[PDB]
Amino acid sequence: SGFRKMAFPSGKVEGCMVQVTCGTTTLNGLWLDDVVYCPRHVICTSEDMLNPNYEDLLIRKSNHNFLVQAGNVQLRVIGHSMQNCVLKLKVDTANPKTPKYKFVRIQPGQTFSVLACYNGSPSGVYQCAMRPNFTIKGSFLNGSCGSVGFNIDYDCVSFCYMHHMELPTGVHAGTDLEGNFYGPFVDRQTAQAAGTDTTITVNVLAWLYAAVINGDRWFLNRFTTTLNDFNLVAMKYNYEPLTQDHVDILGPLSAQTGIAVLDMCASLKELLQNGMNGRTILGSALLEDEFTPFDVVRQCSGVTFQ
Amino acid sequence: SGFRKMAFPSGKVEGCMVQVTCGTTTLNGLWLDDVVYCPRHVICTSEDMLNPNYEDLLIRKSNHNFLVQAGNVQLRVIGHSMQNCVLKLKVDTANPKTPKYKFVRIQPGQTFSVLACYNGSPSGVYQCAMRPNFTIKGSFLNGSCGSVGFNIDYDCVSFCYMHHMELPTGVHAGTDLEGNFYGPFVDRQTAQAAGTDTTITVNVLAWLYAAVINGDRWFLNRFTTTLNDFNLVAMKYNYEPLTQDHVDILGPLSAQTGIAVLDMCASLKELLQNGMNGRTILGSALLEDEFTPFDVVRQCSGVTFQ
Ligand SMILES: *[C@](O)(C(N)=O)[C@H](CC1CCC1)NC(=O)[C@@H]1[C@@H]2[C@H](CN1C(=O)[C@@H](NC(=O)NC(C)(C)C)C(C)(C)C)C2(C)C
Numbered sequence: 001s002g003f004r005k006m007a008f009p010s011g012k013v014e015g016c017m018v019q020v021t022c023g024t025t026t027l028n029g030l031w032l033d034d035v036v037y038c039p040r041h042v043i044c045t046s047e048d049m050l051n052p053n054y055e056d057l058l059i060r061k062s063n064h065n066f067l068v069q070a071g072n073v074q075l076r077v078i079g080h081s082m083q084n085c086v087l088k089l090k091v092d093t094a095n096p097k098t099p100k101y102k103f104v105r106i107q108p109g110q111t112f113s114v115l116a117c118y119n120g121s122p123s124g125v126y127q128c129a130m131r132p133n134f135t136i137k138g139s140f141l142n143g144s145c146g147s148v149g150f151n152i153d154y155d156c157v158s159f160c161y162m163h164h165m166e167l168p169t170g171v172h173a174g175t176d177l178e179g180n181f182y183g184p185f186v187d188r189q190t191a192q193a194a195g196t197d198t199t200i201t202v203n204v205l206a207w208l209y210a211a212v213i214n215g216d217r218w219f220l221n222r223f224t225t226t227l228n229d230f231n232l233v234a235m236k237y238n239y240e241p242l243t244q245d246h247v248d249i250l251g252p253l254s255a256q257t258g259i260a261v262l263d264m265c266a267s268l269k270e271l272l273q274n275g276m277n278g279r280t281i282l283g284s285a286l287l288e289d290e291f292t293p294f295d296v297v298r299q300c301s302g303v304t305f306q
Numbered sequence: 307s308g309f310r311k312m313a314f315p316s317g318k319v320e321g322c323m324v325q326v327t328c329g330t331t332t333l334n335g336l337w338l339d340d341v342v343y344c345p346r347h348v349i350c351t352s353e354d355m356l357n358p359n360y361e362d363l364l365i366r367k368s369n370h371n372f373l374v375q376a377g378n379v380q381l382r383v384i385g386h387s388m389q390n391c392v393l394k395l396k397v398d399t400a401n402p403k404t405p406k407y408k409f410v411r412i413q414p415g416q417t418f419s420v421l422a423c424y425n426g427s428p429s430g431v432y433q434c435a436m437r438p439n440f441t442i443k444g445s446f447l448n449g450s451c452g453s454v455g456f457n458i459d460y461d462c463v464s465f466c467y468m469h470h471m472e473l474p475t476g477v478h479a480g481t482d483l484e485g486n487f488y489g490p491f492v493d494r495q496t497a498q499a500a501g502t503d504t505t506i507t508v509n510v511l512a513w514l515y516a517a518v519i520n521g522d523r524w525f526l527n528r529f530t531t532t533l534n535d536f537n538l539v540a541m542k543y544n545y546e547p548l549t550q551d552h553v554d555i556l557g558p559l560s561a562q563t564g565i566a567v568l569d570m571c572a573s574l575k576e577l578l579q580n581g582m583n584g585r586t587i588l589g590s591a592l593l594e595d596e597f598t599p600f601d602v603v604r605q606c607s608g609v610t611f612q
């Protein structure tokens with residue numbers, strides 16, 4: 001038993017990380033087949049960041065200005081192109097460690113693993129949720145740009161995030177692997193706002209299920225609610241509305257525990273209205289929303305990866 | 307910026323995980339050079355677990371009764387021996403993915419990464435602290451025995467933990483890689499108690515430093531304390547005593563923030579006596595003790611690994 005926030009094993013992604021240098025800027029790239037993907041602001045000086053014309057800046061660069069290094073070994077750059085907010089560098093060698101992969105656009109409320117890298121060298125791995133306001137709460141210092149997010153389905157790596165920037169209070173923003181930002185952000189050092197965020201209700205319920213599965217059940221009560229009644233409570237507490245689609249997704253956890261989703265909702269309602277009264281659930285004194293239903297099913301059933 | 311509980315990249319350890327089967331029991335093994343290490347209770351039936359004589363049980367087994375599989379490929383077992391609570395299976399092939407490694411005995415209050423595996427297949431990675439009572443709070447289902455804990459110093463993997471058993475409330479126990487249990491535990495399904503645990507004070511202070519470094523500073527106050535005065539407070543709250551050795555270890559974080567350790571102690575004292583008043587620190591509503599000083603320095607300075 002036990003329930004922990006868990007990342008995917010990172011080995012398949014470690015084999016794809018490279019260092020990309022353009023002039024004075026060193027950040028990370030992702031090497032898959034004969035292409036290296038990295039944030040396009042690798043081409044910028046500090047002053048360019050304030051108001052960049054990326055088309056004009058990239059015109060000043062040639063293949064030989066992009067220094068790509070895979071471990072100690074230099075890659076030869078034979079082409080370059082900009083796709084949205086990423087740069088793609090064509091190299092003369094296919095990465096012999098290329099895993100089976102896809103590029104996916106993750107939905108708000110879903111999770112992924114981040115392999116934080118510096119100078120093309122993997123530092124550590126952690127899980128993130130894509131917040132409803134299209135930000136993540138990660139750990140990214142200067143040098144981490146180009147670090148990626150991913151999920152692993154058996155042997156296939158689905159890349160979903162590349163790190164670009166930070167917003168006030170350690171809030172992080174980035175792109176899919178086609179260079180499209182999640183959310184309203186642009187890659188310019190100028191005032192920008194993230195939306196109001198909201199709590200991912202289906203994820204809170206999944207985590208309460210995880211708690212019951214792990215024997216932490218003090219918060220279960222004699223009550224029930226309706227979808228409508230729960231949703232009036234969700235709206236007062238800045239929780240996203242619960243839908244029948246979410247009830248259906250919670251089915252495996254309802255079946256494992258025998259606790260109907262609307263009875264677990266009545267527990268959640270009492271925890272929102274009354275607080276935790278100094279008690280903890282799965283070692284937390286707050287209601288946790290960064291575990292998806294799949295995350296709880298996968299962990300509380302033991303799925304693995306080749 | 308940002309501060310997250312982060313595991314080491316797991317690729318070097320993924321390349322060492324195998325499946326070990328003896329009769330009806332399948333669990334994980336660790337393949338380094340031409341040896342596979344696994345928990346010795348792989349040899350037990352369910353009934354044997356209740357009161358095993360491991361010497362007598364192992365005598366009934368030959369090399370060809372240990373089925374070792376590395377991916378889809380079978381290893382040949384050419385010798386077996388028991389060392390404390392592990393079995394060592396000599397195989398006829400050195401693991402070609404063997405990293406630079408050491409076996410270390412971790413101290414209480416230190417952290418390590420766990421690569422949770424099932425059937426020899428890596429499932430996920432998370433960080434654990436060795437509690438002062440020589441247990442860990444992990445996520446281990448049936449099939450996870452033999453999963454290991456480790457740290458990475460640049461390119462060298464220091465293995466420190468192998469998973470064996472669970473105690474009430476999802477508390478986990480296991481051995482070093484010489485098969486010596488951490489704590490008082492024995493590998494028998496009979497009543498056993500873990501000691502009273504205590505909170506790792508130096509780790510709480512490191513995490514308050516992490517909070518200040520990340521701009522979360524509402525809990526800083528106009529007060530100071532002494533080592534003696536703080537320690538009377540630590541004892542009332544089941545915190546380990548703070549020593550000058552711990553003050554010295556916190557030096558890099560004191561220097562980064564300009565906040566003397568005894569001034570941060572005065573903040574900790576007020577948080578213990580008054581609680582958090584419904585506020586959070588680095589996204590937590592509890593005081594966190596599973597980050598070492600090195601963990602905070604490494605993350606809040608960006609150290610990486612080859
Ligand atoms: C990466 O490029 C990298 N080299 O690692 C970097 C990570 C940050 C963490 C400190 C350096 N990303 C940026 O520097 C990024 C690039 C400029 C400025 N960036 C920011 O993240 C800035 N944020 C920002 O201006 N926020 C708003 C837009 C005002 C809310 C920093 C002030 C953190 C540097 C661009 C192109 C956005």
Ligand SMILES: *[C@](O)(C(N)=O)[C@H](CC1CCC1)NC(=O)[C@@H]1[C@@H]2[C@H](CN1C(=O)[C@@H](NC(=O)NC(C)(C)C)C(C)(C)C)C2(C)C
Nearest residue numbers: 347355447448449450451470471472473493494495496497
């Ligand atoms: C592993 O062997 C494995 N196959 O994965 C297993 C992990 C646990 C998680 C459920 C199965 N470890 C054990 O089964 C372990 C082996 C027997 C019994 N074990 C226990 O962990 C038991 N705990 C226990 O008896 N606790 C005390 C000692 C009474 C406090 C379980 C009841 C969880 C099975 C031995 C040799 C200790």
